[PDB]
Structure formats: C-alpha cells, structure tokens
Design a protein around this ligand. Structure first.
Ligand SMILES: [K+]
Ligand SMILES: [Mg+2]
Ligand SMILES: [Mg+2]
Ligand SMILES: [Mg+2]
Ligand SMILES: [Mg+2]
Ligand SMILES: [Mg+2]
Ligand SMILES: [Mg+2]
Ligand SMILES: [Mg+2]
Ligand SMILES: [Mg+2]
Ligand SMILES: [Mg+2]
Ligand SMILES: [Mg+2]
Ligand SMILES: [Mg+2]
Ligand SMILES: [Mg+2]
Ligand SMILES: [Mg+2]
Ligand SMILES: [Mg+2]
Lengths: 48, 112, 62
RNA sequence: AUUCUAUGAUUAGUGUGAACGAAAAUAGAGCAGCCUAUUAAAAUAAGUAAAAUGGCUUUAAAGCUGUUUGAAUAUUGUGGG
RNA sequence: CAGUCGCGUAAGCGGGGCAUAGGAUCACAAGAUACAAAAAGGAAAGAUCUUGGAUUUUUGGAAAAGCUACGCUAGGGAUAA
C-alpha cells in the first residue's frame, strides 16, 4: 500500500503511456519522454 | 571517419632536402610511414593539428572533379556467425513437431 | 516381431517394456508430462485461425 | 419432405482442462406426393408467437418448458428465420 | 541498425542502481493496432502490441477437517515390534 503504480500519459494525445512506481506521499510524476507514435520527445503527465 | 593528421617537422640547420629526392620517396610508396620518412631525412616533429572526414553528400562529386577512384564502393560490417554447430531441438513440445504426433498438435503448435 | 515368444527371439518375457512400471502395467496419457504444466498453458495459444479467408489457387507465369 | 450408411470431421465450435462435437455439401440405398389427403381430416389456426424469471438443450441463436404477462394480418412487404 | 533526447571543449557515455535475494497461463481492467466481422452494412464476441492488480508461499501455480480396537482390498518387506 506504501507504493502505487501510476500511468504517465502522453500529452500528444496519441494514447501512449509509461508506468512507474512512486510513494503515495509524493507529488504526481511529470517527465519528458519519447513517444514512438509521433517519434518525438513530448510531455508525459500522470493519469489521475 | 578518417583522421587527417597535419604534421609540421623541423629540418636541422643547413639541411635542405633535395626536390627530387623528396618526390622519389613517394614514387613507389602506397603506405606512407611518417616514422620512416622522419628518420631518412632526419626531421623533428614540432607542430600538429587534426581534422576528420567521413562520407557526405558531396563526397561523390568531389571524387569526380579530381578523378579519384573508389566512389563506387560501400563497406559493410563483417558478420561473425555463431560458432556452435546445429543441434536437435529439445523438449516435450519440440520432439512432437512432426506429422507423427498430429493428434497432439493442439499442444505443440501456435505456442505464444 | 512377435513379442513374448521365447528368450532367444530377443523380445521374450517382457516384449520390450522393462520391469513393472506404469508403462508395463497400464498406459500413460499422451499429453502427460509428469505434472509440469505444458508450454501451451504457461504461454497460451497465440493468434487465431481465419475462417473467412478465401483459398486461392496460385498460378505463376512461369 | 422423411429415413438408413459413408465422407465432410481427432473440422467450425464449446470447455480452465480432460474431452465433447455440428451443418451446408457430396456419394450410395430408396424415391411420392398431397388436402378430392385412396379413407375419409382445415372454414388456414391467440393465452398462440413472444417477453421477464426458474431450468433443459445449447455456441449467446434456434428448439422444450413451470410461474407471471402477452402481438400482428400476406411480396401493394403481415409474420418466422 | 533505425528513430530522437540528455550531458560533454572533445573523445565519447547513456536501453536505471558496484555485483549477487520479486512466479506464468487463464480470467478481469486500462490504452493502442485496422487484422477478421457466420446473408449484407454496423456491432458484439475475438486476434496482435503495451500495461496493471497474486504468502497462485505445497511459490512449473487444487477452493479441502477428523475417527475406526467393527474395519476392507491391492501391495511392501523397497521403512517398524
Ligand atoms: K432472433
Ligand atoms: Mg534382451
Ligand atoms: Mg521398448
Ligand atoms: Mg519396439
Ligand atoms: Mg513381472
Ligand atoms: Mg519403466
Ligand atoms: Mg477447435
Ligand atoms: Mg398458418
Ligand atoms: Mg414459446
Ligand atoms: Mg432462445
Ligand atoms: Mg420462434
Ligand atoms: Mg455481417
Ligand atoms: Mg513446485
Ligand atoms: Mg526452478
Ligand atoms: Mg475397546
């Protein structure tokens, strides 16, 4: 319960996502990742 | 990429290389060796600079203007195949891949 | 090969079965691997078979 | 049209598995159509079709069914699949 | 190898952690792929890729408590008095 699996959704609206683990008592994750659908690095934000 | 090494060597006092002896060193030499060229004429390397060069969009035409051969040649990485000799597949599902066990192909075929 | 017809035939008294095992008394199911789960289960069956695709007779210009 | 045999088919498909398992079509055996049925019957079918629910069968369809409810009128496109 | 990002003067390094201790299928759920779509147009239910939830701890993965001195059968002396 201490750890949760979150989903980082591509802001290019392509439907690609990454999954990472982070503690519950932590701010949501936000990273700059590569999207293989558009083949470029875009912004990924946590789902919820 | 190729390394183009620019060397600047110093001649000893009052040692003027002959114009012909210099042009004869390159007459029948395909693998130029700075090590041998240095000891023969008793030179001393003092200066140096470097720049690289690789295949580009203009490499083809440049060879045509100056009539350089080899532009119609490409280099592919040499492949080293496995050194292990072929063997027979092992396992319950691998032994039963032939028509003999056609009644058991529901367990041996289309396996994820 | 007529089994169980004397020792000098090479197939007598056991018929090439061994000594008192399941393979001698009865029969072992063909899909049985001793209990280990088969790959078709641990991996699953991949894909589907197309039941609507047309079967064409292939003819080459050769 | 029905019936019997084989193929289709250790198939489609169902099932966690073990296993279970069609039809179209094909071939053969026979062949027969009718209501004026070669034995004496219909004024063309309503608590029926169908639905919900509990089951059977089964591939979720179709088919059988207890309980509670409950349609339409023919290709001038009415009803079932 | 391709794609495209970071750091670095540069050469170059980077597909987590100095190394050695976290289980599948099935089912279910969330995204993508445009494959097939049982007359036809759609869809449903399927297929492929990515991902998630397991003392499945008898951890290659059953939902599972005892008595028999009333006891029975097949075996072992492969383990006792
Ligand atoms: K229907
Ligand atoms: Mg012998
Ligand atoms: Mg034998
Ligand atoms: Mg033999
Ligand atoms: Mg014996
Ligand atoms: Mg044996
Ligand atoms: Mg099947
Ligand atoms: Mg009628
Ligand atoms: Mg009814
Ligand atoms: Mg029905
Ligand atoms: Mg009906
Ligand atoms: Mg259709
Ligand atoms: Mg085990
Ligand atoms: Mg192991
Ligand atoms: Mg007593």
């Amino acid at each position: 319960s201490r750890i949760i699996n979150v989903r980082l959704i591509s802001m290019a609206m392509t439907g690609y996502f990454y999954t990472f683990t982070r503690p519950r008592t932590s701010l949501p994750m936000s990273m700059l990742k590569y999207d293989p659908i558009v083949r470029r690095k875009v912004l990924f934000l946590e789902q919820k | 990429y190729h390394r183009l090494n620019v060397f600047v060597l110093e001649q000893k006092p009052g040692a003027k290389i002959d114009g012909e002896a210099l042009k004869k060193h390159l007459e029948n030499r395909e693998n130029f060796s700075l090590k041998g060229f240095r000891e023969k004429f008793d030179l001393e390397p003092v200066g140096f600079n470097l720049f690289r060069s690789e295949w580009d969009e203009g490499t083809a035409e440049v060879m045509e203007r100056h009539g350089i051969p080899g532009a119609e040649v490409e280099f592919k990485r040499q492949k080293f195949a496995s050194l292990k000799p072929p063997r027979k597949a092992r396992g319950w599902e691998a032994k039963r891949q032939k028509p003999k066990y056609k009644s058991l192909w529901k367990y041996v075929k289309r396996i994820a | 090969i007529r089994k169980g017809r004397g020792p000098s035939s090479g197939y007598g008294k056991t018929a090439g079965r061994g000594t008192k095992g399941q393979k001698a008394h009865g029969h072992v199911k063909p899909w049985f691997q001793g209990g280990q789960t088969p790959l078709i289960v641990s991996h699953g069956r991949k894909g589907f078979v197309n039941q609507f695709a047309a079967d064409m007779s292939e003819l080459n210009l050769e």
